[PDB]
Amino acid sequence: SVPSQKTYQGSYGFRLGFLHSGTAKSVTCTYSPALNKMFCQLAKTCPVQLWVDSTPPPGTRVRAMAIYKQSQHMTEVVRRCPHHERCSDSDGLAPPQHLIRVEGNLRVEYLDDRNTFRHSVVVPYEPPEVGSDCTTIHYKYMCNSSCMGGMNRRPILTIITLEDSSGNLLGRNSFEVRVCACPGRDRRTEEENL
């Protein structure tokens, strides 16, 4: 019982983009092309860019979902650790257990799948204005990679799916995530092994 991670550009040429932020000590969020991996800080904005060759129909929705990267952990549902789950950091919209939030969107919607028990967060797709090339969604990870009782140092992927108003699949892309203190340092260090 594991959700697909196969890349699928679909009819609209769906692709993911990121800020080219570098690895200076102070950066809150930074992406590695070589690793296909996002490094970001706990509860900080992590911008993900949606790129399309053609504008998807109105009613299109954008869902984000987390799964564990290692195959022997994939069936386990990724959720916040007991401490954070119990934390007073609610924004009034996100369920307390949910790892991934979206900020600054009053039309945000959260799901507990009645059959898989997996969490996900979905927002209406917005087209870029004619002077921009992509759409930006501001994600937040609400639990650390090192949190004991949660992910517990196990690496995760985020799966972004493009779907119509009826929930049918239009596109899919994914990237690995590490939530940590000092993404800049951890990115340079992990990239050094190459």
DSSP sequence for 103-130:
-S-TT-EEEE-TTT--EEEEEE--PPPT
Give the helix ranges, DSSP H, for the chain: 82-85, 183-192
User: What is the rounded distance in angstroms from the CA atom of residue 23 to the CA atom of residue 30?
Assistant: 7
User: Stretches 18-26, 58-66, 79-87, 123-131: which one binds Zn ion (CB under 5 A)?
Assistant: 79-87
- Is 87 annotated among the ligand-binding residues? no
Report the alpha-carbon angle 130-134-139, nearest 5. Answer: 135
User: Stretches 25-33, 125-133, 149-157, 182-190: which one binds Zn ion (CB under 5 A)?
Assistant: 149-157
Are 108 and 138 in contact by the 8 Å Cβ rule? The answer is no
Give the nearest distance from C-beta 84 to Zn ion in angstroms.
3
For Zn ion, the closer of residues 12 and 68 by Cβ is: 68
Q: Does 143 sit near Zn ion (CB under 5 A)?
A: yes
Q: Which residue from 81, 99, 121, 177 is in contact with Zn ion, where contact means CB under 5 A?
A: 81
- Is 81 annotated among the ligand-binding residues? yes
User: Stretches 20-28, 101-109, 125-133, 148-156: which one binds Zn ion (CB under 5 A)?
Assistant: 148-156
Residue 172, CA atoms < 13 Å, CB-side half-sphere: 13
Binding to Zn ion, residues 17-76 (CB under 5 A): none
- Annotated binding-site members for Zn(2+): 81, 84, 143, 147
Residues in contact with Zn ion by the rule CB under 5 A: 81, 84, 143, 147, 150
